[PDB]
Write a protein that binds this ligand. Sequence first.
Ligand code: HEM
Ligand code: HEM
Ligand code: HEM
Ligand code: HEM
Ligand SMILES: O[C@H](c1cccc2cncn12)C1CCCCC1
Ligand SMILES: O[C@H](c1cccc2cncn12)C1CCCCC1
Ligand SMILES: O[C@H](c1cccc2cncn12)C1CCCCC1
Ligand SMILES: O[C@H](c1cccc2cncn12)C1CCCCC1
Lengths: 324, 331, 330, 328
Amino acid sequence: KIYGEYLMLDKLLDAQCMLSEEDKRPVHDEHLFIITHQAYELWFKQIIFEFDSIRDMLDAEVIDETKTLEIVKRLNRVVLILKLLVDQVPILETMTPLDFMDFRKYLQSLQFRLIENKLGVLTEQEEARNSIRNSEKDPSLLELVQRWLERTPGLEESGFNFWAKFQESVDRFLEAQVQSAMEEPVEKAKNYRLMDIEKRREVYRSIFDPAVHDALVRRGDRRFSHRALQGAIMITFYRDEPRFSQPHQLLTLLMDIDSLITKWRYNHVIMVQRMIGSQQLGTGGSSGYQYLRSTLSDRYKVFLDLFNLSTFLIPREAIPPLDE
Amino acid sequence: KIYGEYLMLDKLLDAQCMLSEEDKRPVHDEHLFIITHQAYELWFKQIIFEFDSIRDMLDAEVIDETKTLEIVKRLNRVVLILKLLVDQVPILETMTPLDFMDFRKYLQSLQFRLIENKLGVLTEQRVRVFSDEEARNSIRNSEKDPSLLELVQRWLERTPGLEESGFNFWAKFQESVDRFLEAQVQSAMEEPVEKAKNYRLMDIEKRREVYRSIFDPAVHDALVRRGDRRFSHRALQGAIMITFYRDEPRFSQPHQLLTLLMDIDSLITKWRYNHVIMVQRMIGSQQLGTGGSSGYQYLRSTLSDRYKVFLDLFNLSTFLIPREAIPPLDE
Amino acid sequence: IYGEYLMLDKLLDAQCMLSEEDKRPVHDEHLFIITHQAYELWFKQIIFEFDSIRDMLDAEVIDETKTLEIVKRLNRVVLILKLLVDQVPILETMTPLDFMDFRKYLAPASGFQSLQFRLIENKLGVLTESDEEARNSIRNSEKDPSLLELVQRWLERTPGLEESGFNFWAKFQESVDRFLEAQVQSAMEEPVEKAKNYRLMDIEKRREVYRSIFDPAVHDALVRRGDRRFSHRALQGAIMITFYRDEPRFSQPHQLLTLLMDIDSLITKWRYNHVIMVQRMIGSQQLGTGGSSGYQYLRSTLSDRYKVFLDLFNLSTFLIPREAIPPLDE
Amino acid sequence: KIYGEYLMLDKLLDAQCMLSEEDKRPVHDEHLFIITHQAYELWFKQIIFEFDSIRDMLDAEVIDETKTLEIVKRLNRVVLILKLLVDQVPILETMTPLDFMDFRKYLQSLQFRLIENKLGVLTEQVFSDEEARNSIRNSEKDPSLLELVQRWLERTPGLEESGFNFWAKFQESVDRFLEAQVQSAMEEPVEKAKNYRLMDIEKRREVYRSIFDPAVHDALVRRGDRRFSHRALQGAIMITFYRDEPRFSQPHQLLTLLMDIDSLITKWRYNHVIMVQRMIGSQQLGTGGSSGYQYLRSTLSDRYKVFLDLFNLSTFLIPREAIPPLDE
Ligand code: HEM
Ligand code: HEM
Ligand code: HEM
Ligand code: HEM
Ligand SMILES: O[C@H](c1cccc2cncn12)C1CCCCC1
Ligand SMILES: O[C@H](c1cccc2cncn12)C1CCCCC1
Ligand SMILES: O[C@H](c1cccc2cncn12)C1CCCCC1
Ligand SMILES: O[C@H](c1cccc2cncn12)C1CCCCC1
C-alpha cells in the first residue's frame, strides 16, 4: 500500500553487493557497475513483459483494429525503453579502465537472451534452462508477424488480388521506361537507362519467382515466407491509406527495435574496447571482443526483409488503385 | 560469482508485485509503473552514493587538483544519471489515464528527499512525514550533516587569490569597476545622438546598483535574509573570481565544478517540470481521491527558485566586466 | 547538381562576422551566426508545415486521409522543436567574455526579435502579452485563423456530439450524476468517521469540477477570465476524444491533440533553455541591457499565459472510470 | 546591425527553391529535403571553421595548458554539433519513399569531403569547379588533424630518455609484472586454471611485442591495422596511463574527444545508410544497381575510422601498482 511497501524497496535496495568492499579493498566505481547492470535487467523484464503480451495478441486468427493499436502502443513503448538503454552506456563509460581493472577479479544475461529469442534471433545464426527452451520452441515475434502478414486483406485472388495486379503494373511500367529510354538523344544516357531497366527486371525476378525467393531464404538473405513478403510489400505501398497506416506503423516499430538493438550492441562493443581493448589479462586473446563484433552483422537483424522493401517500389501512378 | 548471483537478480527480479493481478483484476500497465519507479530508485541510490563520496572529499581543509578532478568526474556522472531520469518520464506517459485509474486504488520517496537534503534544499523552503526509525535517522542525518551547498561554500571561501596579503582580488575588482564605469561615463558624454547618450548614462547607473549589491556586505546580507541569495559574502567572491579566470588552467577545473552543480540543479527542475506535466496528463489538477488540487499545486510550487540550491551561481554573469577591464593574474 | 540545387552560393554567402570586419575578430561569433541561421532555417520549415496544416483544417470535411497527413506534419514539427531545444547547449559552449567582445555590433530589437519566431507564435495561437512585407506578414498571422481556432472548429464538429446521433454530452452528464450518487452511498457506509468526511468533502470537489463544464455560464466566465481558451463545444469534443482514445475512430484525433500538446510543451522547453542561456551569458542585467527588464520579460513567457492549448492539458480532471463512461453504440 | 541584416536573412531565406513547385507538380516534402540539407551544410561550415582553428593551434612547437583547454572546448563543441546532425536523420525519415520518388527526378557535398580530409580520412582508403578543386587539393596537402595530433603526441613530456624516460620504465614494469604472473600461475592448484593463465600470459607477451618491437609496429602500420607513428603511440599510451593526474587529464580529454568525433561520424554514416535503404532500398530506378548503397556500407568499416589507434590503447594497460610512478 505505501510507496516503499508497494515497490518492495526493502528487497530492491538490498540487492547491491560490492565484492571489492566485501574483500575490504573497495573500488567506488563498482557501485555504478552493479546499478547500471541492474537498471538494464529491470528494463529487460519490462521488454519481456511487453513482448509476451504482444505475442499473445498476435497468436489469434483475427487481429482487429483495436488489438492492432495496443500492439503499436507496446512496440513504441519498447522503442522508448531501448533508446534509454542505449543512453545508459555513456554512464558506465564514466568509469576508468584502471578502476574497472581493480575489481574485475571478482567477476551472459538470461533476460537479454530471452529478448533475442522472443524477438526472433534465429538459433542457427533448471528454471533458466526451461526459460531459454520455451523461448526457442514457442513462436517468436518474427514467426507471429509473418502469419499476420500472410493473412493481410487484399492478397486473396478472389478479392483485391494485389500480387497479380502488381506484376502487371510492373510489366507496363518497365515497358513505358524502355520506350522512354529509346527516345533518349544521347547514346550514353540511353544505354545507362536500358542497363538500369535490366537491373530492375532482375529485382522483380527475385520476388515474382518463388524459387528465386526460396533460394535467398535458405541462403540467409531473407527470413520471410513468400506470402509474408507479399503482405509486407502491400502495406508499404498503401501506407498513406487509413486501412494500412496502422499495420505499417507496426512494421516500422519492429524495424526501429531491430535498429536500436544494433545501436546497443555497437555502443557496448565501443565501451568494451575503451575498458579492456581487443584483449586484456583474463580475456585469453581477442575471442570475446571479436564475437561481439560479429553480432553487428545482418545475421543478427531479425526483420532484415523489412529494411529492403523500398527496392521493389513503383511510382504512385504505377501502383494499382484500391477498389474493395 | 556468476552474473545472476553477482547482481542478485533472484532478489532484484523478485520485487515486482502487481496488486491488480493479486486482486484478479489485472492492469497490464501496472508492471510499467513498478519497473519505472524501481529504475528511479536504483539511480537515486547511485546519486546518493556519489553525493556522499563528494561530500567526504569536500569535508577537508585542503582539496588538491587530483581530488578536484575526481569530484568533477562524479558530478558529471550524476549529470548523466539525471538526464536519464528526465527521459524516463515519457516512458511512463505511455500509460493511459484510464488504465492508471484502474489500479490507483491499491496505492513520498525517502531517497528523493535524501538527494534534496544532501544537495542543499533548505528545510525552511519546503511548501506544506515517514514512520520508520531507519528512515527517520536517515532524514535527520541528511539535515544535520553538511550539505553540498555548505561544503562548496567553504571551498569557495578558501579560494586562493582572495587573500589581501596575496593577490587581493576583491580590492582590485572594485578599482577596475570604478575606472571602467568612469570611462563609460566619459564615452557616453561624447555620444552625438542625445537619446543614446541618456540611455547609456541610465544604463551605467543600473551597473552601479549591481556592484552596490556585491561591494556592500550589508546589501548582500539583506538579499541572503530575503532569500534571493544563499552564499556567504566570501563564497560569492570566490565564485565570481573563478568565473572571471575560467579560461586560466588554475581556475578551469573549479569552474567546471560550479558548472556541473548548476547543471544538476537545472536537471532536477527539468525532472520536476516533466513530472508535473505527466501528473496533469494522468489525473489533471484534481481527481477522485485527490481532495482538491492541493497536491498538484504543491508540485507547481517546487518549480520556484526557492527549490534551486545553487541559485547564486546562475546570476554570476551579472557582475562580469570585459577582458580588458579584469585585473590580470600575477602570483 | 548538389550545390546548385541547394543554392549553396547564396546560403554559404550569408555568414559575416562584424568582429572580423572591424579587425578585432572573435572566433565564437561564427558559432553565434550559424546557430541563429540553423534556427531560422527550421523556423521557415515549421511555418511551411503550419501553413499546410492550417489549409487542411480550413475545410468543413476533414477525412481520415487528411487527418493522417496532419498527424505526420505535427509529429515532424515535434522532432524539429526537440532539435532546436538541443541547439542551445551548442551556443552555451561560448564563454560570456567571448560573447562580450562582439555584442557591440548587435542591435537590441524594436519589438519582436525574429520575424519567423513571432509568425510561429501567432500561427500556433499565442496571445503575445517593422517593414511593409514584415508588417503584412504579422498582420495576416493575427487576422487569419490560427491553429487554435481551426482545431476548435474541427473539435466542435466531432461525430458523437450531436443530439440526434450519439448525444455524448447528455449521456456523460447522466453517467456523472449516477457515479457521484453511488460514491455518496459508498461514502455513507464508511465505518471510520474521518474517512467518511474526507470522501464527502472530495465528492463536493468533484461536483464543482463538473459544474465548470456542465454549466455553460461557468465555462464562459473562465474563458473571459483567461483560465480557458476553448469554446464550450470544442471542450466537449476534446473531452469525448480523450474518453474513447482506445477506439480506432478516436485514436487518430487523440494523437492530433497529443501532438499539439507536445509542440506547446517543446516551445516552453525552448523558452526555458533560452532563458537559462541568457542568464549564463549576461546574467539578469548587463552593460547595454538597461536593467533586468528584458530578462524579466523572458521569465514571464514561461507562464501558462503563453501555452496555447492550455485546455487540453487539464482534460484528465473530468475523467470517470471505464465502467462509468457511456458505451459506444452508433 | 539589426537581426535580419546581421544574419543576412534576405540571402539565407532566399536559397530555398523547390523544383517540383517550379514544374507545377509540387511535392510538399521537397521543402523538408532542402532545409534538412541546408541545415547540414551550415553545421558543416561551422565544423570546418572549428577544425581549421584547432589545426592552426596544433601547428605550433609549443602547445601550453591554455591553448590545450581551447582545443578541448572546440573539440567538445564539434562533438555536440555531430550529435545534432545524427539527430537530423529521423526528421528526414518523416518523408515517405513515394513522396521522395515524386521529386527525385529533379536531383557528393564539398564540405563533407573537406571535413573527412581535414580530420584525416586517408584518400587511399568528382568536382569540376576551380574553387572546389583548389579546396580539396589544399585539404589533402595541408596537415590533417591526424598528422598534427601525432606530432603533438610525439613531443609529450615524459617520453624523453634524458628526462622521465617512460617507454624504458614501461618495458621493465611489463617484464616484472608478467614474470610475477607466471610464478603465480605456476602455483595454481587447479590444473585447468594453471594452463589457462599460462596461455593468457603468452597472449599478453604477443601484445607487448607489437609495441616494444618497432619492426612489428611498422608492419602493422603498412598492413593498415595502425596509422600512428611509433613515438605517437608511446605518447598516447603514456597519457592513458596517467589520465587521473592533472598534467595528463586535459591531454587525455583531447584524445577522448577525437575518438568521440570519429564514433559520431560513423553513427551518422550508419543512420544515413539506414535512411537510404528506407527511401530507395539497395537499388532503385536510376541507381544502376546496388553500387551506391554498397559503397555507403563500405564506409562503415574501420578503414574510415581516423583515430583507429586510440580505440585500442586499453589493450596495453597494466595495473595501478605495476605502472611506474611519476617523479619529475
Ligand atoms: C565495464 C563494461 C563492460 C565490459 C568491459 C563488458 C565486456 C563484455 C565482453 C568481453 C563480452 C563477451 C562475452 C565474454 O567474453 O564473456 C560481453 C557480453 C555481453 N555483455 Fe558486456 N561488458 C560491459 C558492460 C555491459 C553492460 C552494462 C551490459 C548490460 C546489461 C552488458 C551486457 C552484456 C551482454 C548481454 C552480453 C552478450 C551479448 C551478445 O550475446 O550478443 N555488458 N561483455
Ligand atoms: C502515474 C504517474 C504519476 C503521477 C500521477 C504522480 C503523482 C504525484 C502527485 C499527485 C504527487 C504529490 C504528492 C501527493 O499528493 O501524493 C507526487 C509527488 C512525487 N512523485 Fe509522482 N506521480 C507519478 C509518477 C512518479 C514517478 C515515476 C516518480 C519517480 C520515482 C515520482 C516521484 C515523486 C516524488 C519524488 C514526489 C515528491 C516531489 C517533491 O517533493 O517535490 N512520481 N506524484
Ligand atoms: C548568446 C545567447 C543569447 C542571449 C544572451 C540572448 C538574449 C536575449 C534577450 C535578453 C532577449 C530579450 C529581448 C530583448 O530585450 O532584447 C532575447 C529574446 C529572444 N531571443 Fe535570444 N539570446 C541569445 C540567443 C538566442 C538564440 C540562439 C535564438 C534563436 C534563434 C534566440 C532567439 C530569441 C527570440 C526568438 C527572442 C524573443 C522571445 C520571445 O518573444 O518570447 N536567442 N534574447
Ligand atoms: C532522402 C534521403 C537520402 C537518400 C536516399 C540519400 C542517398 C544517398 C546515396 C545513394 C549516396 C551514394 C552516392 C550516390 O550513389 O549518389 C549518398 C551519399 C551521400 N549523401 Fe545521402 N541521401 C539522403 C540524404 C542525405 C542527407 C540529409 C545528407 C546530409 C547532408 C546526405 C549526405 C550525403 C553524403 C555526404 C554522401 C557521401 C557519403 C560518403 O562519401 O561517405 N544524404 N546519399
Ligand atoms: O502520491 C501517490 C503516488 C503513489 C505511489 C507512487 C507515486 C509516485 N508519485 C506519486 N505516487 C499518487 C497521489 C495522486 C494520485 C496517484 C497516486
Ligand atoms: O563477460 C564478463 C562480464 C561479467 C559481468 C558482467 C558483464 C556484462 N558484460 C560482460 N560481463 C566480462 C568479460 C570481459 C572482462 C570483464 C567481464
Ligand atoms: O546522390 C544523390 C543525392 C542527390 C542530392 C542530395 C543527396 C544527398 N545524398 C545523396 N544525394 C541521390 C542518389 C540516389 C538517388 C537519389 C539522389
Ligand atoms: O536582443 C539582443 C539580440 C541580438 C542579436 C541576437 C539575439 C538573439 N536573441 C537576442 N538577440 C540581445 C540583447 C541582450 C544582450 C544579448 C543580445
